[PDB]
Predict the 3D structure of the following.
Amino acid sequence: SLSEYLTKFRELNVIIDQSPDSLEALIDLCHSSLSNLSKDIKANLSSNVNFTEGLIPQWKRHLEEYGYLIQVLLTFLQMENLLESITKLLEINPEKDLFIGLFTRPLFVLLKMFIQRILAMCVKNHGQSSSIQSSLMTNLTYFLHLSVFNAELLKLLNDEYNYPQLTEDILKEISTRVFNAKDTTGPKAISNFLIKLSELSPGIMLRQMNLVITLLNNSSITLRCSVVEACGNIVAELAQDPQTMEHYKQQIAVLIELLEERFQDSNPYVRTKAIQGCSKICDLSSKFNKSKAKFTSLAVRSLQDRSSLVRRNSVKLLSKLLLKHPFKAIHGSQLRLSEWEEYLKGSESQLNSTSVLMKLKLMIVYYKDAISFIKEIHKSIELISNLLFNRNEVLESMDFLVLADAFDIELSEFGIKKMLHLVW
């Protein structure tokens, strides 16, 4: 009577610890040391009959009634024992679909180490990806704190258990499901979940980036912030274990182009989050010649903004790009305009007057990049000097230009004079 039991959803110790009617009476009576001894004896008996292999309907019944009574007891509420028993009965691997559903949904309603193990070991179902996907959807739609837990579970599915089929399936369903902007507390939870999944397991979130394009054009600012932090963490990871993959290279290219596009988005929060993302991905272990060049140009054209926090975030951008500038090949920590101009003029005079030609032309391109960077820093210093003359922007911008002046420039004395004129 599996369907009937699903729809409906002392003297006993003398027979449980030592027929159908007796089993039904015991199940009705059981529906706390006796409960613990019963769960251990049932767990080891199930493990034994599964390791040793007509009699399956009795076990099916017993497990159905026991799961129902355990669900009732847990939704009614000495706790670690029942979690341990659940983990034990989960290792022994239709009615199983409803069984795992009635284990997951009440636990989702109730929702740490044993609970984490329970949530990790209950996804061993095969072919039932639709049910777990639907439960995760209802969790993300109704629950808020379960976002980081689902992120950790997907991470364990990524690296711990190494089951890429379920991970790819869940990622495809997440990237293909429709989203609405009128959701209350929904986009924030989804953004937190995606941020945690990116900072904790960015290896799978990158493979399906060809489909997250529809999520890249989301109207919600929280989703845009989340995907920006996600691609930032992805670029960081791809700089850690370079793997030097070509598909990952073109993914980096397209996401960084989207970042240059979003650098002028119509919201201060998404702009600051993109600023944090490029601040996290600029100081990695790579060259990024054109990447840093376009970073510097788009930071020098947008330094004269209108908001407050975006201005200080761009100042921190300039600070981080100055303290880690690639112009350290010849006489590093020195950006004298005349020192580069004289070398450029000498190279241009030597041009009109094979490997040697390659090396001198690459040095010429390097000097051109250096002089463009120095004219950009000059114009940005001019802009910030005519703009500064909010106390937070005043107190956060001093450390930037003092180290900018530490690198000797032709505007050193004029910059100091402007600083003095500004401080009063």
